[PDB]
Amino acid sequence: DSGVDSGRPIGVVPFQWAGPGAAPEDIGGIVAADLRNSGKFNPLDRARLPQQPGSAQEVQPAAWSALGIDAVVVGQVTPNPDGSYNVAYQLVDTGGAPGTVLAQNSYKVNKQWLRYAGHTASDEVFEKLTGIKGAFRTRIAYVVQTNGGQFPYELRVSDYDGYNQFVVHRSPQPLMSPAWSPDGSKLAYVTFESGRSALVIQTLANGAVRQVASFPRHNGAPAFSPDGSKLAFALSKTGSLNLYVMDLASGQIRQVTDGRSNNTEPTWFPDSQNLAFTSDQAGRPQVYKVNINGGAPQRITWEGSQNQDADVSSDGKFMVMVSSNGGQQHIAKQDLATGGVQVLSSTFLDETPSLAPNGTMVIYSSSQGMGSVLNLVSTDGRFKARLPATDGQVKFPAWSPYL
């Protein structure tokens, strides 16, 4: 819903490093990358910075408004004797009230939390300048297939931008489609470890695992309801996949769809009652919507030869999905009210899109020979980037809720 050329230009100056040598991290670089990733901003190339002020007072507004820049982010990174660091940023106005500090904060963090300090600065500048909750301190879950033979599959979690990865679960068999609990503490996912498909929910903090379902099938594509009370997923035995809803408090499972049609990849609407999902009911896959509390499925995608793997935004205003047309398979966004569709990505064979909690960015995977990598694309379509390559093929990314 930004629908413009580039984003709002903004000056993000490298942070001053008072400590000896060089800085342990490029905080300004992180803030710029974050802001840019959202498609909401176009940080000025470090090449064209008119100056590199190290403090708000050193900022000369005229130099920035001149280049069409409303605000400038300046900052300082200072080493503490205990080995930790002080990361401070000041958001300085270079427009209506030149030189005034719109926002500033300072954080004391260990080397390991320096990127977090950067993402915090980004979140603050972001919420202050867009009114939209920042998602820069969010994480993503995904599955990497390494080249190791014993446990090729690793369900991992990392910062949304690919850094600070950690393994949640390693498996000798395929792992797929993790899904975050709304409170960000658990991941549901499908594992073939038992030899056949199973749906589990693992608590990230202690690794605890809850068995949910095992009926005969393949990928269950789980999805937690926004309110935390249910988990929707697909089971395929009768010869076709159908939707089931898991009541998390009681464990009672109820079938939400029936028929010879393959109904899968459920995703929740904000009300925790309606699901959007993929069905082959009309031939090539299309996206349908159904209220778990009663009613028959309602096809909702009409544009495109095929649409699947939907992800409804947190505000229910739109959804992203994999849309195939003219031999191109990309992530597309569909307005849930007016039905307009906008193709976001342009990479090769885009799959499983997952919306950032503020709905400003989508993480998805694309094809690379026999493998695949993760990508980010802002929901306004302005920014596209590969996430940092890792030691394996990556699939099924899932963006965490706000943390």
Swiss-Prot record:
User: A GO biological process this protein is involved in?
Assistant: cell septum assembly
Q: Name one GO cellular component term.
A: periplasmic space
Q: What phenotype is described for loss of this gene? A: Mutants lacking the tol-pal cluster suffer delayed outer membrane invagination and contain large outer membrane blebs at constriction sites and cell poles. Tol-pal mutants fail to complete division and form cell chains, and fail to process denuded peptidoglycans at the septum.
User: What UniProt keywords apply to this chain's record, in alphabetical order?
Assistant: Cell cycle, Cell division, Periplasm, Signal
Question: Can you provide one Gene Ontology molecular function annotated for this UniProt record?
Answer: protein-containing complex binding
Q: Do the record's keywords include Cell division?
A: yes
- Pfam families (UniProt xref): PD40, TolB_N
Enumerate the subcellular locations listed in this protein's record, separating them with semicolons. Periplasm
Protein task = Part of the Tol-Pal system, which plays a role in outer membrane invagination during cell division and is important for maintaining outer membrane integrity. TolB occupies a key intermediary position in the Tol-Pal system because it communicates directly with both membrane-embedded components, Pal in the outer membrane and TolA in the inner membrane. The Tol-Pal system is also required for polar localization of chemoreceptors clusters. The system also appears to be required for the activity of several outer membrane-localized enzymes with cell wall remodeling activity.
Q: Which family does it belong to?
A: Belongs to the TolB family.
* Notes on the domains: Effector proteins that bind to TolB can both negatively (Pal) and positively (colicin E9) regulate association of the distal N-terminal TolA box with TolA by influencing the conformational equilibrium experienced by these residues.
The record's subunit annotation is: The Tol-Pal system is composed of five core proteins: the inner membrane proteins TolA, TolQ and TolR, the periplasmic protein TolB and the outer membrane protein Pal. They form a network linking the inner and outer membranes and the peptidoglycan layer. TolB forms homodimers. Interacts with the peptidoglycan-associated lipoprotein Pal and with the C-terminal region of TolA. Interacts with the trimeric porins OmpF, OmpC, PhoE and LamB. Can form a complex with Pal, Lpp and OmpA. Interacts with colicin E9.
| Matching HAMAP family | TolB
What is the protein name for this chain? Tol-Pal system protein TolB
